[PDB]
Amino acid sequence: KVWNARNDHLTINQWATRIDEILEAPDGGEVIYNVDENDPREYDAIFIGGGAAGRFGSAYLRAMGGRQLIVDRWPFLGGSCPHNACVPHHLFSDCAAELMLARTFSGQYWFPDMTEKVVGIKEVVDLFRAGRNGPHGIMNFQSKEQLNLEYILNCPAKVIDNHTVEAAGKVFKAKNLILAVGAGPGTLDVPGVNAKGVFDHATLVEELDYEPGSTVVVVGGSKTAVEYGCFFNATGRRTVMLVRTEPLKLIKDNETRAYVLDRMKEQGMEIISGSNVTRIEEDANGRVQAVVAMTPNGEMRIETDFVFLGLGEQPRSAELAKILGLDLGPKGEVLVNEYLQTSVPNVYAVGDLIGGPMEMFKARKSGCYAARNVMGEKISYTPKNYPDFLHTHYEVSFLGMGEEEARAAGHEIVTIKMPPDTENGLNVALPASDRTMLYAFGKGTAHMSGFQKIVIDAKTRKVLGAHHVGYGAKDAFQYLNVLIKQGLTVDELGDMDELFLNPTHFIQLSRLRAGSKNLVSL
Amino acid sequence: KVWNARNDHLTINQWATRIDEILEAPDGGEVIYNVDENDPREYDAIFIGGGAAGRFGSAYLRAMGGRQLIVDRWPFLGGSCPHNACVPHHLFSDCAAELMLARTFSGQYWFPDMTEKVVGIKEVVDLFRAGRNGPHGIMNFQSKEQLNLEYILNCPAKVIDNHTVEAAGKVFKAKNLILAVGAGPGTLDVPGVNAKGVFDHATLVEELDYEPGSTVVVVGGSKTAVEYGCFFNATGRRTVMLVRTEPLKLIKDNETRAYVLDRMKEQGMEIISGSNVTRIEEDANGRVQAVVAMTPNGEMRIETDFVFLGLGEQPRSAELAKILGLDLGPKGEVLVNEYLQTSVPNVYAVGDLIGGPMEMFKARKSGCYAARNVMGEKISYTPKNYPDFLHTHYEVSFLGMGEEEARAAGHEIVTIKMPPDTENGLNVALPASDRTMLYAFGKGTAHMSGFQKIVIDAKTRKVLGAHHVGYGAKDAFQYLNVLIKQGLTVDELGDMDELFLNPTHFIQLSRLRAGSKNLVSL
Numbered sequence A, B: 001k002v003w004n005a006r007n008d009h010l011t012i013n014q015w016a017t018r019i020d021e022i023l024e025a026p027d028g029g030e031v032i033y034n035v036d037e038n039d040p041r042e043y044d045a046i047f048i049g050g051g052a053a054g055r056f057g058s059a060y061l062r063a064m065g066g067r068q069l070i071v072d073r074w075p076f077l078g079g080s081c082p083h084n085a086c087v088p089h090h091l092f093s094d095c096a097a098e099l100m101l102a103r104t105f106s107g108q109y110w111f112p113d114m115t116e117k118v119v120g121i122k123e124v125v126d127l128f129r130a131g132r133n134g135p136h137g138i139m140n141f142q143s144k145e146q147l148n149l150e151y152i153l154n155c156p157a158k159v160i161d162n163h164t165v166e167a168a169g170k171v172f173k174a175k176n177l178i179l180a181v182g183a184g185p186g187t188l189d190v191p192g193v194n195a196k197g198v199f200d201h202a203t204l205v206e207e208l209d210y211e212p213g214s215t216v217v218v219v220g221g222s223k224t225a226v227e228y229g230c231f232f233n234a235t236g237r238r239t240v241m242l243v244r245t246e247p248l249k250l251i252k253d254n255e256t257r258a259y260v261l262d263r264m265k266e267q268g269m270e271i272i273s274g275s276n277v278t279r280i281e282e283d284a285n286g287r288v289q290a291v292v293a294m295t296p297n298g299e300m301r302i303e304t305d306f307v308f309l310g311l312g313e314q315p316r317s318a319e320l321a322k323i324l325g326l327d328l329g330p331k332g333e334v335l336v337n338e339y340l341q342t343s344v345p346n347v348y349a350v351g352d353l354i355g356g357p358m359e360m361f362k363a364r365k366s367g368c369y370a371a372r373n374v375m376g377e378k379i380s381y382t383p384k385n386y387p388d389f390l391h392t393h394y395e396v397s398f399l400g401m402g403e404e405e406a407r408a409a410g411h412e413i414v415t416i417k418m419p420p421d422t423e424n425g426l427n428v429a430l431p432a433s434d435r436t437m438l439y440a441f442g443k444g445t446a447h448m449s450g451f452q453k454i455v456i457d458a459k460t461r462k463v464l465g466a467h468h469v470g471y472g473a474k475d476a477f478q479y480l481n482v483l484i485k486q487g488l489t490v491d492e493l494g495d496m497d498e499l500f501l502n503p504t505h506f507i508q509l510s511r512l513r514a515g516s517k518n519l520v521s522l
């Protein structure tokens, strides 16, 4: 029933095995009790949820010298990230990128013939299921042994009041509560949505007991929809995306968005805009057999036995909002001020629970800032001007303004991009670097080597936006964004030391134009 | 003989084709003459060589409003980079990484059975030869049409004196000369070094007319040797590296270097330290049949019909020094002051010609600084504290101080790395991100997911060094290094916005420890 793990010190691999056993427990498994029974201090904060926001907030609070407690219904820390969100998404995207390369060079060099080859979606999901306890293990281990945190896992938390939480049969008090229970997968209110064969990111890694047929229907047009859709397409299946409005509106630069969309279509993906599913058809056995949708051109029917819903995420605020009387936003997000404080005294909310942006940097930092405030360090947090990214069969990175956006916003600008604007268009051997060299050199594949661009204010000479499609630039955007927030100019970018051949050619391309007082686009 | 191209406007692809024809022409091909015969201004500088240093120096000088002329014996601009250096090297490294991936997951999912599979080296070299004109075409096009450069290609320059140069049968005067002829491949002074089957980066892409046997011997232990050696090994050939002293001394962090070397040996590479080739054995046909070398454990003979020399490059200074009277350094490098000025009046030297470090940033920047000085802007260039990288089957990036180096420097330090130092060792699902997810999740492949670390001063809290083995961090090191030179602390690093899952986990890991006054390693 209840396991006092406090004085047990499992290694990373032992935790992995223990977590698996607890997950495959018919009765649900024993509660993991990791509380220090010597500490006389009252918890400065109890975190409802031990995902990215809860675990990081706890790590920072503890590091500051305060006391904290995490209560999570899962037998592992880390939350959705390692179980059904970021981690599997990246494994699937890695597969999508490698498969695109394999299909492109099928039967050439060492690449086998991919012609009639269909990779199994379940096959790959099963790979993730078989190894996700690795990350689970690291989380419990690092949190307990390295970050000195206290926690109770595999036990839903019962919030009594703004200072009281019930867990593992016990009752705990705390000066503050930090709500970090995240969000749940959006869905549709159409007939058949509950049919077997309908999945979302969460159920996909829990209930896929068959290998999908040749046609897959994805509903949605943003990150999740595109990331998973490209993976499904990559396995060799006809992938049809049903987008309510238009896809990838997140990509503000028009040329960048068009490149990403064109490359998706070139891989065989079908994207139908202005479409709404009206019915998911069931066969005699209650399994999906087709999807019916209304489009600008009328109703359409797509035969499929596998539907993936990539809609938004809805903050799990209902219960907590009822018990505490928290003020909520129009999408159900818990409202909070710049210090992450809710409408209820001593109650904070962080991560996905407070709405967009739903990213790991937001979850972790909000968690930490809430902790710092709980510890007396009054610090505000209002996420703005952050870099962003998503996967198709490529890595797509972006920060700041798109080109048209900047011109419309009154900025006189010049752009520096690759490939250049010429009659040969994308059919040239640049941009190019790690993981795009085969495309750059292959027969008829040069247009696949990538696309990138920086938008610059002609007068201040400052970089207003950066955009990249290819591989190996995502990490750089984290640091480039800080430099840009500090006031980076084309001259300063040009005076840096590049590491050729570089995923982003921004440094040397800037240098080619920085010598003039009057900037010219490249 | 001389094609006046000034008023012709070939596209990138037409340039690619034209250059191909000139390179294959039995008579040597026409001279490409792109000079503005109506511009009466004197040349501020004539660049001898139009590779990285000469082309960027020219672009910057023209951008500043000056007049320049490039003379290059190759029919294209860009120099060794696109023809036989950086570019092919990256195509080979891309293959090496994909091949290690395919061999690791041999016969799994979409991966073909690699067991008895030997990839053709000539096949890949041939792929490079067939597509290198793409990059050549862009160089000629961009230079002429976007950068407004004047140039004469496919013509060796004949320097008359410090103000006079003959090209295309014409004599040109200039206020200055900027020498940018680069360096030639290093060789060994041993018997048989001229036997067929012995190559260096340059001859490999011009003279490989056979497919190498099952064993390859590489001589050298730094960047070139290791990059090409891993590629050869990845094709499925037994690869022995003969290192005069120690391999990869450039990787100062012992722990980082060890991981890299261990992964190489795991791939089957044999790295022999303190070894010197004494003789290269030829068979009766004049082809290498074996290599004999002295080692710490005596003499050894390796049978092979393919030897690759990855020694250093040797500045092409002889002729120019005899004509102009240039002071040379011990390795034949042209000596220059911090303004890139040689001992000769109005003569500058840049790029590989002035010695190490021989990198593209150094070549391009020295060319631009020399150009600025020629234009009246007194500015010094002294390369120091720059990021660096190299390829094995992984991308290896480093900057600043290694852990041991920081301590010997008198710094009290802590480090944050992945994976953590536990008894499970590297056999854990971290670090992980794009292109390392399969290793992170594969059966028994977790130790291959990478290694990374930042070195921090325990008192000042400043990051003194960063090291990474995996994929996708190289571009990031370009920007991160700038931040580090600015005085980056673990607190500032921790307050950035990460894009999870990130090649470098530095941001969030720093955040996990930044909450404490007294830092503790992770």
Ligand SMILES: Cc1cc2nc3c(=O)[nH]c(=O)nc-3n(C[C@H](O)[C@H](O)[C@H](O)COP(=O)(O)OP(=O)(O)OC[C@H]3O[C@@H](n4cnc5c(N)ncnc54)[C@H](O)[C@@H]3O)c2cc1C
Binding pocket: A048, A049, A050, A051, A052, A053, A054, A071, A072, A073, A074, A078, A079, A080, A081, A084, A085, A086, A087, A089, A155, A156, A157, A158, A180, A181, A182, A183, A201, A224, A313, A316, A350, A351, A352, A353, A357, A358, A359, A360, A361, A363, B499, B500, B501
């Ligand atoms: C498919 C997908 C892919 C994504 N990929 C990325 C990506 O690549 N990069 C990125 O930056 N972001 C990505 N995100 C977004 C990111 O996953 C989230 O923003 C982040 O996980 C939110 O963390 P959190 O701590 O707020 O919530 P969560 O991780 O959702 O965790 C909430 C935690 O609280 C627990 N909990 C809930 N209710 C209770 C209760 N009553 N009692 C006890 N415990 C409870 C849960 O079990 C869970 O552990 C992705 C999201 C999805 C859906």
Ligand SMILES: Cc1cc2nc3c(=O)[nH]c(=O)nc-3n(C[C@H](O)[C@H](O)[C@H](O)COP(=O)(O)OP(=O)(O)OC[C@H]3O[C@@H](n4cnc5c(N)ncnc54)[C@H](O)[C@@H]3O)c2cc1C
Binding pocket: A499, A500, A501, B048, B049, B050, B051, B052, B053, B054, B071, B072, B073, B074, B078, B079, B080, B081, B084, B085, B086, B087, B089, B155, B156, B157, B158, B180, B181, B182, B183, B201, B224, B313, B316, B350, B351, B352, B353, B357, B358, B359, B360, B361, B363
């Ligand atoms: C195998 C290899 C891999 C490398 N990989 C990288 C890498 O990944 N990243 C990096 O940053 N650096 C890399 N480098 C180093 C980089 O290639 C060089 O530092 C850089 O190319 C030097 O540029 P440069 O302009 O000084 O010389 P070069 O590029 O060598 O060009 C000199 C030019 O002068 C011309 N020339 C010579 N003699 C005459 C003459 N008499 N008349 C007219 N023209 C003449 C040549 O034809 C040529 O175009 C690599 C080097 C090698 C050998």
Ligand SMILES: NC(=O)c1ccc[n+]([C@@H]2O[C@H](COP(=O)([O-])OP(=O)(O)OC[C@H]3O[C@@H](n4cnc5c(N)ncnc54)[C@H](OP(=O)(O)O)[C@@H]3O)[C@@H](O)[C@H]2O)c1
Binding pocket: A089, A186, A187, A188, A219, A220, A221, A222, A223, A224, A225, A227, A243, A244, A245, A246, A276, A310, A311, A312, A313, A356, A357, A358, A359, A389, A390, A391
């Ligand atoms: N960094 C990453 O890699 C990553 C990956 C996945 C998710 N995330 C984050 O996780 C959150 C949720 O992901 P998300 O992809 O769903 O993003 P989102 O930006 O919330 O987009 C929701 C998508 O679902 C569609 N949608 C919502 N309700 C619908 C309905 N009733 N019918 C039809 N379509 C509907 C929307 O279409 P319209 O816009 O056309 O209405 C839109 O394409 C986001 O904040 C996101 O940024 C990040």
Ligand SMILES: NC(=O)c1ccc[n+]([C@@H]2O[C@H](COP(=O)([O-])OP(=O)(O)OC[C@H]3O[C@@H](n4cnc5c(N)ncnc54)[C@H](OP(=O)(O)O)[C@@H]3O)[C@@H](O)[C@H]2O)c1
Binding pocket: B089, B186, B187, B188, B219, B220, B221, B222, B223, B224, B225, B227, B243, B244, B245, B246, B247, B276, B310, B311, B312, B313, B356, B357, B358, B359, B389, B390, B391
């Ligand atoms: N960024 C990149 O990817 C990249 C790739 C290739 C080259 N480069 C640059 O190009 C330049 C030359 O490349 P490099 O790889 O040769 O680097 P380098 O650092 O100059 O190393 C020279 C290597 O050649 C060996 N060597 C030299 N003379 C030798 C001799 N007589 N006998 C046996 N071994 C001998 C050295 O051995 P010992 O040191 O053990 O004596 C050493 O391993 C460098 O400045 C380099 O950084 C950069």
Ligand SMILES: O=S(=O)(O)CCS
Binding pocket: A050, A051, A052, A053, A055, A056, A077, A078, A079, A081, A082, A086, A087, A135, A360, A364
């Ligand atoms: O952000 S956390 O480290 O808690 C989970 C990463 S998978």
Ligand SMILES: O=S(=O)(O)CCS
Binding pocket: B050, B051, B052, B053, B055, B056, B077, B078, B079, B081, B082, B086, B087, B135, B360, B364
């Ligand atoms: O540095 S140059 O742009 O001249 C050649 C790059 S391959």
